[PDB]
Amino acid sequence: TAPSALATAAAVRAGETTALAETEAAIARIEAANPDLNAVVVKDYDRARDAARALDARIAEGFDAPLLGVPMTIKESFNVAGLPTTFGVEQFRDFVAAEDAVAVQRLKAAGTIILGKTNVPPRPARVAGGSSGGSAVALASGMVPLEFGSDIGGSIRVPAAFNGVWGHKPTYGVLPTDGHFFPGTDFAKSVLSVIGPLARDADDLEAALEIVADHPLAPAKRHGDQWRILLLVNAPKAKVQRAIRDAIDDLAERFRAQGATVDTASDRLPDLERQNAAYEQMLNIAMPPTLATWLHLHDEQARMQRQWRRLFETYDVVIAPTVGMTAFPHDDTPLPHRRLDIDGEDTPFLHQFAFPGLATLPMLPATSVPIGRDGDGLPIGVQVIADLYQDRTALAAARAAHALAWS
Amino acid sequence: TAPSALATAAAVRAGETTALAETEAAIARIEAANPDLNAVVVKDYDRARDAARALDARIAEGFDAPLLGVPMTIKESFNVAGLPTTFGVEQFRDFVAAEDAVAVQRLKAAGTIILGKTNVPPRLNPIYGRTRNAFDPARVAGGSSGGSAVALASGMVPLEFGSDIGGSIRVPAAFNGVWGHKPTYGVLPTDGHFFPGTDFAKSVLSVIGPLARDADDLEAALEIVADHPLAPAKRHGDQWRILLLVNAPKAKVQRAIRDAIDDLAERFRAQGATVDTASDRLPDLERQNAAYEQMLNIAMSVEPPTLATWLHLHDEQARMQRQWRRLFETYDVVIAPTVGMTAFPHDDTPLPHRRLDIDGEDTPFLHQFAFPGLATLPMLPATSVPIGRDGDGLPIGVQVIADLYQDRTALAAARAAHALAWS
Numbered sequence: 001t002a003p004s005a006l007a008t009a010a011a012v013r014a015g016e017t018t019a020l021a022e023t024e025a026a027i028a029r030i031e032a033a034n035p036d037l038n039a040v041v042v043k044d045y046d047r048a049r050d051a052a053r054a055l056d057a058r059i060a061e062g063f064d065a066p067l068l069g070v071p072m073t074i075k076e077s078f079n080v081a082g083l084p085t086t087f088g089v090e091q092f093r094d095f096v097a098a099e100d101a102v103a104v105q106r107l108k109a110a111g112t113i114i115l116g117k118t119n120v121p122p123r124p125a126r127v128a129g130g131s132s133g134g135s136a137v138a139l140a141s142g143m144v145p146l147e148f149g150s151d152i153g154g155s156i157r158v159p160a161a162f163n164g165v166w167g168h169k170p171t172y173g174v175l176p177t178d179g180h181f182f183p184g185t186d187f188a189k190s191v192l193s194v195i196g197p198l199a200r201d202a203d204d205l206e207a208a209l210e211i212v213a214d215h216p217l218a219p220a221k222r223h224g225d226q227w228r229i230l231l232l233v234n235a236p237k238a239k240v241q242r243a244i245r246d247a248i249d250d251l252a253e254r255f256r257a258q259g260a261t262v263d264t265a266s267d268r269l270p271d272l273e274r275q276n277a278a279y280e281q282m283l284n285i286a287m288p289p290t291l292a293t294w295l296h297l298h299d300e301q302a303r304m305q306r307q308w309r310r311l312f313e314t315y316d317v318v319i320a321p322t323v324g325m326t327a328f329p330h331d332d333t334p335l336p337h338r339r340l341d342i343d344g345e346d347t348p349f350l351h352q353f354a355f356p357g358l359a360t361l362p363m364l365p366a367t368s369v370p371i372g373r374d375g376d377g378l379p380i381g382v383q384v385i386a387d388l389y390q391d392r393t394a395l396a397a398a399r400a401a402h403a404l405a406w407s
Numbered sequence: 408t409a410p411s412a413l414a415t416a417a418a419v420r421a422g423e424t425t426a427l428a429e430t431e432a433a434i435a436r437i438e439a440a441n442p443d444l445n446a447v448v449v450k451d452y453d454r455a456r457d458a459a460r461a462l463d464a465r466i467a468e469g470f471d472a473p474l475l476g477v478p479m480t481i482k483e484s485f486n487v488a489g490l491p492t493t494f495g496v497e498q499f500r501d502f503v504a505a506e507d508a509v510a511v512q513r514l515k516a517a518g519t520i521i522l523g524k525t526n527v528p529p530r531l532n533p534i535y536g537r538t539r540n541a542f543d544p545a546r547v548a549g550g551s552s553g554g555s556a557v558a559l560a561s562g563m564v565p566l567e568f569g570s571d572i573g574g575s576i577r578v579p580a581a582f583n584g585v586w587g588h589k590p591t592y593g594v595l596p597t598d599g600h601f602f603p604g605t606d607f608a609k610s611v612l613s614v615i616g617p618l619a620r621d622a623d624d625l626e627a628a629l630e631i632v633a634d635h636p637l638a639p640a641k642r643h644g645d646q647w648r649i650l651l652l653v654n655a656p657k658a659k660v661q662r663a664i665r666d667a668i669d670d671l672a673e674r675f676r677a678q679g680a681t682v683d684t685a686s687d688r689l690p691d692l693e694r695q696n697a698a699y700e701q702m703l704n705i706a707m708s709v710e711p712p713t714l715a716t717w718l719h720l721h722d723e724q725a726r727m728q729r730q731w732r733r734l735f736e737t738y739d740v741v742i743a744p745t746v747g748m749t750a751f752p753h754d755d756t757p758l759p760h761r762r763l764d765i766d767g768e769d770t771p772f773l774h775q776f777a778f779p780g781l782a783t784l785p786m787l788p789a790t791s792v793p794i795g796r797d798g799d800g801l802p803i804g805v806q807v808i809a810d811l812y813q814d815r816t817a818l819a820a821a822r823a824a825h826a827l828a829w830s
Contacts, residue, residue: 077543173593174635178729187718189725215812216636291714295607306598357791389635 002142004205005070012059012069019059019069023052023113027072029143030115037124039137041076042083042117047384050384052113065111072137072146075131076117078104079179084243087120087183101179103148103195103212112146112212120183123153126327126378132167135198139165146208146360147198150180152286154308154323154356156196157368161381164370166398167198168205171389172363174213174229185389190286192279192360202399205367209391211229217389220396222316227260227397230311232320232385235354236273246296247372247380247405248319254404268314270307270362272354279357280350283336299311305362305388312387317397319384322368323355358385365391369398371405409436409562411546412477412624416518419476426459426476430520430730431724433564434480437522440561440743446554447480447563448535448650449490449524457519457816461763462545473627479566481516482555483524485615486599487511490524494601500534508599510615510632516630522564526554530573530603530777537753539741542584542801546750547548548596549725550579551603555618559585567618570602573703574746574779576616577791581745583806584793587618588625591812592786594633596624610706612783613720622822625790629814637812640819642739646679647820650734652743655777656692659765667795667803674827688737689731690785692777698723699780700773727784728811735810740820742805745791749801782806789816789822794828 003185004013011017042102048071055069057068076085078128079097104114118134121127128137132149136159149156151169160167175195181295182190197208208219222228231252233245252262280302283295311318324342331338338349365386372380384401386394414493418424434452441447455478462476486492486504488771511521526535538553540546541560548557552569556579559567569576571589580587595616597609617628625799629635642648653660653668672682677809702720705712713772734741747765754762760771781788788809795803809817 216638218636289714291712291717292709294714294717295709299608 002200003145004201005145005199006207007068008070008145009066009068014063019055019113020049020052021073022069022392023048023115024070026115026144027288029141032290033141033143037137037141039118039134039143040073040116041086042136043118044080044114044116047082048113048115049308055111055113059281064210067107067146068111070112070146071115071144072107072112073116073144074114074148075120075134075135076120076387077150077181077183078117078148079181080104080114080117083117085181087181099179102176104179107148107208112225114159115144118147123184125329127330129162129327132198133162136160136163136165136167139198139200139305145200146204148195149198150193150195150209151184151356152182152190152193153353154361156198157322157356157366157383160175160198160368160377161322161370164379164381165198165200166205166370167368168196168209168391168395169198169359169366169368170209170276170391171193171365174214174215174217174389174391175209176214184287186286192282192286200279202353202369202402205394206392215393219391220393223314227255228314228316228317229255229260229262229397230266230318231262231264232318232358235358236276237351238324238354239345239347239351240321241326242343242380243326243374244321244324244380251319251371251401251405254407255401258404264316266311268311269324270304271394274300274326275304275361276354276357279353279361282361284355301319308362309387316371317384317386317394318383319401320358320383321355323352323382326374326380355383358387359383364388364393367394367398369402371401409565409620410465411621412474412479412565412619415477415565415828416473416475420471426462427456429476430455430459430478432524433522437563439693440563443540444557444559445536445538446525446561446563447485447523448464448526448554449677451487451490451521451523454489455520455522460708462518462520465518472516473631474514474566475518477566478522478564478566479519479521480525480555480558481511481521481567482552482569484522484526484570484601485511485568487521487524492601494787496533506599509596510600513632514568514628517565525558525567527551528785530575531772540750543750543799545752546801547582547753548579548581549683550749551575552618555577556580556583556585556587559583559618559620563618564622567633568615568628570600570613572602572604572610572706572783573714573776574783577745577779577789577804577806580618580791581793581802582750583621584796584802584804585618586625586793587616587791588629588818589616589789589791590614590629590814591783591788594635594637594812594814595629596632596634602612604706605708606706612702612706613785622790622818622825626818627813637814640816641813643737647675647823648739649675649680649682649820650686650738650741651682651684651783652741653785655781656696657771658747658774658777659768659770660744661749661797662766663795663797664744664747664749664803668744668805671742671824671828672793678827682689686734688734690727690734692781695721695727696777696780697785698727699784700776702784724784731758731787732810739816741808742824743781743808744760744778745804745806746778749797749799749803778806782808787811788817790817792821792825794824
């Protein structure tokens with residue numbers, strides 16, 4: 001199995017391996033596996049190896065970093081100095097970003113080596129399933145331990161679940177957006193939108209999160225000695241495959257055996273019909289609107305976040321599907337027309353966006369964690385949603401869930 | 408001198424004093440000083456003393472809290488359960504809040520006891536009257552939070568909490584020679600607090616903040632109420648690197664205030680700090696001020712302003728914040744006047760710009776609002792610190808401004824500033 005990001009930093013710190021060797025080993029991994037899946041749009045190998053060599057010169061002086069010598073890739077929407085952020089447009093190939101995104105600077109100051117950027121698909125047979133799909137595919141291949149992505153409609157969480165890897169969708173506004181060009185956005189720095197880490201294990205996710213964040217994040221906390229969890233499988237006008245509903249039910253039983261309380265229903269449940277409507281409208285503005293319309297959407301978003309805050313007075317986390325289905329076949333149908341099949345039932349594809357909206361509209365943190373595999377073998381991933389700014393609580397609960405599911 | 412909040416919690420924790428005793432002494436302190444001041448307009452004495460007794464029962468069995476047993480009052484705009492919130496001359500006096508505001512819940516979980524609420528005088532009050540500046544009766548308290556600052560200058564309570572959109576935390580604290588902190592936007596939850604201004608929900612730029620007599624009480628209150636933890640003080644180098652901002656576009660500063668700042672900079676230089684009068688990296692105040700006044704009129708609103716104007720106003724403040732970000736790459740803090748003037752006598756009619764006079768020269772009033780805006784528009788944290796008293800005896804307070812989410816850096820530099828000025 002491929003080593004984790006923090007394991008790589010420990011070895012380079014130990015001197016067992018060197019940053020150049022780890023970086024070179026990564027490009028060997030990318031060149032071997034990449035022709036077949038086309039995960040990385042841009043390759044920056046030669047500056048990366050000179051960046052690596054400079055780092056080992058600094059390990060010689062005793063310089064130490066939390067992610068020291070970790071080879072890494074990022075979604076193309078991030079700005080890397082000297083490289084284009086084409087977004088699949090030829091005209092934009094002409095231009096190069098002058099300076100790194102803030103997230104990139106913090107990661108390289110943490111000791112990461114940015115080998116390249118990863119393809120962003122529009123919102124082998126199976127789909128990557130998202131804009132960050134190249135990111136999930138890159139870590140699923142084992143090319144790189146660590147990666148970063150963006151989420152507006154589940155682009156962090158859904159690709160991670162489809163490829164059986166971890167992703168974290170942070171609380172809004174804690175990870176700096178600047179230097180990241182949000183895909184499909186009517187307005188730059190579009191609301192509801194976040195950047196987030198992708199990894200193969202929970203510890204790497206948390207490490208990247210704390211490095212890039214503008215301010216410290218409180219550690220995992222629970223109301224009581226045991227986890228108190230609410231399942232949210234039923235969303236308005238949204239249908240879930242039976243295999244996912246079953247995987248969530250088994251995880252709930254294992255949590256109950258260990259002593260957690262796992263509620264299926266709560267009266268304090270927020271009004272999801274009212275929540276989903278606003279998300280659909282805000283998404284249209286995000287993907288001529290009156291000032292008053294825009295202001296009222298913020299009122300709805302403020303009052304939805306208050307309802308989730310009240311629910312989280314009782315619950316530590318909410319567990320929900322990332323999306324109703326496992327990875328689904330390529331489809332070129334226009335999205336309003338787009339029909340999806342859930343357990344032999346054709347359904348509107350639009351309706352599935354309710355699941356990413358659960359976290360995104362209230363601004364809550366959500367961790368996407370693999371808990372199972374489907375009958376055809378597609379990975380099953382779910383989101384662990386926590387209160388505002390309780391990202392580390394969500395990661396802790398996702399960590400527990402993963403130990404239980406794979407036990 | 409009246410004990411600090413953290414000192415008070417230490418005594419209650421030690422067993423030297425009891426929570427009931429502390430609330431009673433404060434309640435007596437308010438009755439002695441309040442008739443001549445009109446600082447506290449709402450009193451919850453009898454529910455408050457049962458809370459103290461109930462808290463002492465919990466201390467009787469190993470219950471400890473960081474602000475254990477600290478008597479305090481809160482601004483009237485904050486919601487306290489069982490108590491009225493006026494909402495600006497609504498005559499909601501009949502109604503009582505069902506639940507505490509989030510800040511109040513967090514303070515009470517930290518062990519504070521809220522004796523009463525404080526008058527909100529109008530921004531630059533019918534339901535309750537006017538609060539006189541604790542020093543000089545003719546002069547103004549100077550802000551919406553003036554009732555809170557006057558309670559601390561009198562010594563009724565160690566700790567108080569307020570709201571700031573146009574300098575309402577910093578200016579009354581400075582006018583009454585007490586401390587205030589205006590935090591980074593969005594770190595302290597506004598819910599349950601009614602903000603002056605037509606716009607629904609929390610207004611952008613608007614914050615709630617603590618008020619106290621020392622920096623440590625401010626930092627303690629900030630960390631309790633904040634939605635997330637805040638990083639501790641950090642400096643580029645072993646010494647403070649500070650920029651003075653005494654000159655603001657089309658803004659005039661009293662000489663006593665300008666002199667008080669010069670002396671503090673000199674003492675900072677004595678300790679080894681670098682204190683620059685000018686920087687090339689200064690984000691232009693001109694454009695910054697250009698956005699700021701109109702958003703104050705924008706928040707006072709719903710010709711119907713267009714969405715695109717509001718979008719461009721947000722676009723302006725975002726790239727001004729970026730300019731301030733670049734400045735703080737060099738500097739740890741910026742020291743600036745809270746406002747160009749010391750406390751001023753109330754004016755019966757507020758014609759815009761009529762009241763201000765600086766150094767014997769008539770001045771537009773609007774222009775003084777550039778100083779509170781310095782922090783507010785970029786959303787930066789700013790600490791208001793007493794550093795002097797003018798010839799008439801009015802206190803001199805200034806703003807310590809730091810980078811985004813660096814509230815503790817501002818408080819630390821404010822901690823140093825007041826120690827240097829009063830040693």
